[PDB]
Design a protein around this ligand. Sequence first.
Ligand code: 8ID
Ligand code: 8ID
Ligand code: ZN
Ligand code: ZN
Ligand code: ZN
Ligand code: ZN
Ligand code: ZN
Ligand code: ZN
Ligand code: ZN
Ligand code: ZN
Lengths: 347, 347, 347, 347
Amino acid sequence: SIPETQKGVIFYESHGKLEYKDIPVPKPKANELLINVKYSGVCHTDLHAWHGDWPLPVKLPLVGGHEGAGVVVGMGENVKGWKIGDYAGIKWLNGSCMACEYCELGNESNCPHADLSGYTHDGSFQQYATADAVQAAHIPQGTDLAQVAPILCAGITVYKALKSANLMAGHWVAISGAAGGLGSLAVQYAKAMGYRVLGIDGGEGKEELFRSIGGEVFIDFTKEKDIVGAVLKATDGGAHGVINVSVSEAAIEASTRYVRANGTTVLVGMPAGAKCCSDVFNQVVKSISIVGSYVGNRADTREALDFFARGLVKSPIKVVGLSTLPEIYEKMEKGQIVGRYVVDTSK
Amino acid sequence: SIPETQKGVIFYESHGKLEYKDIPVPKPKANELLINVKYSGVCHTDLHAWHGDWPLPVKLPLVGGHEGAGVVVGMGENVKGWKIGDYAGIKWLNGSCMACEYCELGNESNCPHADLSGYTHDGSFQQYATADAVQAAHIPQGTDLAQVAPILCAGITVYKALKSANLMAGHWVAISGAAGGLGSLAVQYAKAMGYRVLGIDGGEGKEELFRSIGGEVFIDFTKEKDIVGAVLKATDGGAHGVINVSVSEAAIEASTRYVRANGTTVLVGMPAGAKCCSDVFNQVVKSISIVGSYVGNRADTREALDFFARGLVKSPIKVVGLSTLPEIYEKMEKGQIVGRYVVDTSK
Amino acid sequence: SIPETQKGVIFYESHGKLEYKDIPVPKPKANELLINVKYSGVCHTDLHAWHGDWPLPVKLPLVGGHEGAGVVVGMGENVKGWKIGDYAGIKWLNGSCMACEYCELGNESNCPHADLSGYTHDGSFQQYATADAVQAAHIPQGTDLAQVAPILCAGITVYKALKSANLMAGHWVAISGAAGGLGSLAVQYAKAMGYRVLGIDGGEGKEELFRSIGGEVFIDFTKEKDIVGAVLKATDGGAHGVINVSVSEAAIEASTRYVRANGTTVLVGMPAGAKCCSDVFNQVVKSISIVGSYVGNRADTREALDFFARGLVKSPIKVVGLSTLPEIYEKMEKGQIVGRYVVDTSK
Amino acid sequence: SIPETQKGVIFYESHGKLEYKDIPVPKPKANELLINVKYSGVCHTDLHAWHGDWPLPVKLPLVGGHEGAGVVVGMGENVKGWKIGDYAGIKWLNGSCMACEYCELGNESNCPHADLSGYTHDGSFQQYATADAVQAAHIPQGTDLAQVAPILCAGITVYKALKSANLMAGHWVAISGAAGGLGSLAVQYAKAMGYRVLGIDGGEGKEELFRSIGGEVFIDFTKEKDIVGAVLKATDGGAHGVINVSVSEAAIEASTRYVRANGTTVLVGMPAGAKCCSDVFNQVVKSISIVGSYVGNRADTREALDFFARGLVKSPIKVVGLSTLPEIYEKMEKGQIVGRYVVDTSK
Ligand SMILES: NC(=O)c1ccc[n+]([C@@H]2O[C@H](COP(=O)(O)OP(=O)(O)OC[C@H]3O[C@@H](n4c(I)nc5c(N)ncnc54)[C@H](O)[C@@H]3O)[C@@H](O)[C@H]2O)c1
Ligand SMILES: NC(=O)c1ccc[n+]([C@@H]2O[C@H](COP(=O)(O)OP(=O)(O)OC[C@H]3O[C@@H](n4c(I)nc5c(N)ncnc54)[C@H](O)[C@@H]3O)[C@@H](O)[C@H]2O)c1
Ligand SMILES: [Zn+2]
Ligand SMILES: [Zn+2]
Ligand SMILES: [Zn+2]
Ligand SMILES: [Zn+2]
Ligand SMILES: [Zn+2]
Ligand SMILES: [Zn+2]
Ligand SMILES: [Zn+2]
Ligand SMILES: [Zn+2]
C-alpha cells in the first residue's frame, strides 16, 4: 500500500547542493492529506526559494515544489470532503488558519499563519507529500495530471491577477513576460476572459509560442528600443491592464509607464531585491493603480481549473524527470524556458 | 448691471509681476456660466501655474484661481440646469471634450482636451469669470461662499481620495500630516463616512486639534520613531486605508508597510518630484494596492458638498482681499503661509 | 449643399396617418450635430410613441425613430470632439440636463429633463436630424451604417443588461427567447464577454441558429416543460445571470427559480403591462437580485460598438425604404414582423 | 461540571404546545462546541418556525432559538480555535459544508447543506446547545451577553443587508419596520455607517424609540395615508436604499415604489406566503434593484460585533425568563414589541 521510503529533491542550506536521494515518506496530520504526487510543475518561485532571494527563510532541509498534481492515498482522521483516490492539488498555499479576518474574506493567501509548500512545508518535488485538506485543490477525475499541474500556481495566480486588474471584455491587457510559465497561461486566461492581449517577452520562438496560444500583439524586449512607446501605440493610449510576470525589475518600471490612465498594473513576479518605483505626480494625474496579487484562494482555484477543464487554457509543457531539477533551474535562470517544465516523479 | 470693466489678478510671463489691475469682463460662450466670484480659495497649485513649472503650456495672459465661489450672473443659450442667482463653484477642471472614453466614465480630469481653471482658462482670481456650466459646482442655497471655497479643491480631492482608498464603515484609515490642511479635511470626511481615523502629524498642539475634529488615534512623529510599529499596534495589523498628504519619500514608503493586508495606500497631491518606492515582495505578499487619486468628478463634488452642507466638514479659513493676492503668492514661494487663505474679490 | 427641404416620416395625432412628406431640414442649436441619417432602425418602441400609449406627452408634430446612423453634416458652435464626416448615431436618449445627480453618475436615462429621440425630439425617421453632440454615438470609421443601426438600441440595451447581470468570465448566463431579436444579440455579446450561454426559445430551427452564433446549451420550450429543472441540471445549480427578453409573467417568474444562489435575474424591455412576482422566501434564501436594466449610457455605447467593430456581434438585417415605413408600423401593430428591419432614408 | 439534564422550550408538531420542560443535554460532535447559553434573543423568525409559515419543514421535536450568547463548556476533538470558557454565539447558521462554491465565496448562508439553529438543529432556547465551531461567533471576553445576543441575527442580518443595498455615506436609507428587532438595529448600523435614516413603523412610542436611537425622519404607518409620497418627499426623490424588515407584504409592495431610481430595495423579512411584485416597466426605466439578503457570514459576524463593541449599536432589550416564550410570541404576533426580547435561560 503506502511505502515508508521515496525519492525527493532536497537541499540542506540555501543555494546548496540539490540532492536527488531517498527520504522518509511523511505522515499526514489530522487536517491533512497524504498525496502520491505524479507530476509537479516547476515555478520560478521554487528557484527564488533555493537561491534565498526572499526576506523570509525557508524550512531546512527543504523539499521544494508547489504545483503538485497527484492522488490521495491517505488522510487525517479530521479530514472530511475527500476519498482515497481523489485527485488533489498541492499549491503554494499549503494551508491557512481559516479562522482570521483575512481567511474569512477569502484572502486565504494573506493569513499570517500561512504554511507554504516548497518553503515552510515539504513540497511536491517528491513522490509523496502532505497538504491541508481544506485548502487542497479538488482535481476532477480524468484530468491529465501532467497538464493540470501548472494551473496550481501559475494558472490560479494569473487568473486571480487578471480579476484584480479589473478589466472588461474588450479592454487591452499587456502581459509582461508572456512566454514564461505564468505568462503563457495569462495569455490564455485573458483571451478566454474577453480581453485584447498584448505580450512582452523575448528569446528564440518566444513570439511563435505567443501567436500559437492566441495572443494578438507581441513586442520583443530583445529588439524593441522603446517598449513603452510600442505599447502606447499598440493599444492606443495604454493597457487598461498590465500583469507583471517577468523576473525583471526593469520590465516592472516600464509597466508603470505604459499602463492606461485609470488602468491597473499588477505586480506578480518578485525579482530579488525588487522595488516598484513610480512618479507620484504621474500616478495621481493619471489615477493609475498598482496592485500586488498573491496566488489565489479556493474559489480562484475552482474557477481557474474550470477553465482548464473546458479546454480554454493549456500550459505549453515539457515533461522530464524529477531527478532533472538542477537542469530545469539552470535553464530557467537563463530565461530559456518556453512555458513550463513539469517533473515526473517516477524518473 | 453687468459691468464691462472689472478688477482681477493677472500676469504676462511665467513668474511675471502680478497685476491687480482692471480687466475686461469676459463674455460667456453659449455653453458657459458667467460667475461673479465673491470669494476664491488660494492653494499652491496656483503657485506652480504662475511659476511655469509643470510640463505643458499656461495660457498667458492669465488670471489664476481654481477655487471660485460665486453667483451665476449670466449664461449662454445652451446652458441647462442653472438659474441666475444660483451659487456656482469654479474647480481645477473647468471643462472637457465630453466626447472621449475618459469623459464618459466620469474621469474628465484625464481628458486630452481638458480645460483647466487658472491655467488654460482664466480662473477665480477676478470679480467675474466664465466656466463650463456642465462641470461647475452647484453650491447649495444657504452655503457661506467664503467657508465653502476651499472645499472646491482640497475638500473634494480629499473626499475622492478616501473613496479611492476603498474602505467600509468601521475600517481604520491612516492620514499622514492629519492636522495640516488637506489633513484636517481628510479627517473630517473620513469620520463622517464611518471610518476610524488614525492621524500622523507632529508639532505644537496638533494632537488637540486632531481630536477636536473626530480623530481617534494620534501618532506623533516628534515623539515616536517606529511609526510603522505604532500604526500596526494601534490598528491591530495595519490601516485598511492610507491617505498620504505628506509626500516625503519616507512617509509614503512607510505607508506600504503600515497598510493592512489587502489594504490601499492612496497618493494625493501634485508634488513635482516625489517617488513612491514599494518593495515588490511586501506589496505582493500583503496584496497591497497603491492608487493615485486626482481631482473629483461632478458626482464626487456634489457628494463632497453635501457633507459640508450638513455641517460635518469645516475648514478654518482666513479671508483677505483679492488686492492683497501677490503678497500671498509671495509667501507661498517661500513657506510663510500659516493656514488656509480665501480671497475676497471686493476688497 | 445642405438642403432646406427633406423627406421624412411624421404624424400630427397620436395614431394619426404617417405622412411620408417633405419637411423642413432642422437647424442644429449650438450644442447639436445635424446628421444626415442614411439608415435607421425600427423597433416597437416607436410603435408606442405613435400610439400615444406611455404616460407622458409626445411632441407633435413628431418624426419618429431612435436608431439613427448618419454622418455629421453640420454642427453648432459649442460642439466638441466631432468633425464633419464623422459617423454618428441617434439613440433613445438624445440629450439631458447634465446638471443633476442622475446625469453625473452616467444614468442620464433617469434625468428629469431627458430629451428622447422620436418622442420629445424629432428622431431618425428623416433624411436630416439633430442630436445633442454629447450623447450621440461615435460610430467608428469603417462601420457599415445599415448593419450598425439596430445595435444603437437593441445591441446596447442587451450589452448593458449583461453588465447589469454582473457575471464573470465562465459564469453561465441564461437568455430567454434567445434566438429572436434581442436574444440573438444578447447571446453574441455574452459569448464575446466570456460567459457560457444557455438559451431558452422554441420553434422552427431556432436551436440551429442559436448554435451558429455561440450558444452552448439550448432549452426548448416546445419539447421541455420543467424549464427550471433543465436549466438547473445543465448549469449544475442555476444560472449565475438571466436576461429576460421574453416577458410573460411565467418566464420571468421562472427566472427567480432557475437563477443560481447569489445570482442576478435581469429585466429588460419596455413591456407595458408585465409584473415580476418573486417568492420572498426563495428570493431571500437564495440571495437573489432582480435588477431592472434600461438603455446604456455613453460608455455602455462606445463599448457595445467596439464589439461590433471587432466583428463579434452581427444582426441579420432587412433593408427597406423609409418611404415604405407606415407599412412596417402597420405590421408591428399586429405582429407580422418577421425579423429586424432597417430603413433606407434615400428610398 | 456538565449536567445531563436541563430545561428547554420545545414543541412536537408545528404550532403545537410550547413545552417548558426537562430535556437531555446534547453531546458535541467532533466539529462542534457545546455551549451553556445564558441568554437568547427571540427572533420573529423563531415564530415563523413554530407556526410553520415557511415551505421547509422544521426538525421535530424542535428546540427553537438562534440568537444564543453563552459559554463554551465542551467541544469536539476536531475543534481548533476555541478554549473552554470562551464566549460563543449560536446564530441562524449553525453550520455550513465549507467546501462548496458558495461557502468559498463567503456566502456560507447559501450552502445547500446549511444546518440551521432553531429549525433543523436544536437551538438556543435551552440552557445547553451544540454548534459548529467554524461558523460560531467569537464573542469578546467581557461582553454583556444579554446585550449582544441580538447582534447574532438581527445585527449581522441588517448589517449585511445594508452592505448589500450599496449605499454611500450621505445617502438615504429607509428602514421598513424601524422599531422591531431587526429595525432598531438597522437604524443604528446605518447611522454608524454614515447614512441618513428614515424609519417606517407604527404603534405606541415606536416613534420615540426611533428618535432616541438616532433616526432622523419617522413615518407612522398607522397614520400616514400615503407612505410612498412621504418617503419621496422626505428624501427628495426616494431612498437610495430600503431595508424591508416588516412582516408585511404590503410594506414590501410600497418599498418597490419609494426606492430612488438606481436605488436598491432589500428583502429581509419573510412574511407567510409573501411575494414581491413590481411593475417591469417601472423597474427597468428606473434601473431599480431588488435584492434578497440572508443573514451574514463570519466576516459579517466579526464586523457586526465590532460595531457593538465600540458602543455604536445597542438593542433596546427587555430581559425575561426563557419559561416566558409563549408570552413573547403572543406579544410579537401583535407587533407590540419595541425592539427585542432576550430570554434568560436561568428563569
Ligand atoms: N505573486 C504570485 O502569486 C506568484 C505566483 C507564481 C509565481 N510568481 C512569480 O512570478 C515570477 C515568474 O514565475 P514564472 O514561473 O512565470 O517565471 P518563468 O521563468 O517561467 O518565466 C518568466 C518570463 O519572464 C520573461 N522576462 C524576463 I526574465 N525579463 C523580461 C522583460 N524585461 N520583459 C518581458 N519579459 C521578460 C522571461 O523570458 C520569461 O518568459 C517569479 O518571480 C515567481 O516567483 C508569483
Ligand atoms: N433574511 C434574514 O436574514 C433575516 C434575519 C432575521 C430575521 N428575518 C426576518 O425578518 C422579519 C422581522 O424579524 P424581527 O425579529 O425584526 O421582527 P419584529 O417582530 O422584531 O419587528 C418587526 C417590525 O415590523 C413592523 N411592521 C409591521 I408587523 N408592519 C409594518 C408596516 N406595514 N410598515 C412598517 N413597519 C411594519 C412592526 O411594528 C415591527 O416593529 C421576520 O420575517 C424574520 O423572519 C430575516
Ligand atoms: Zn487565517
Ligand atoms: Zn509558484
Ligand atoms: Zn487648490
Ligand atoms: Zn474628453
Ligand atoms: Zn429601438
Ligand atoms: Zn439630468
Ligand atoms: Zn457549502
Ligand atoms: Zn433570526
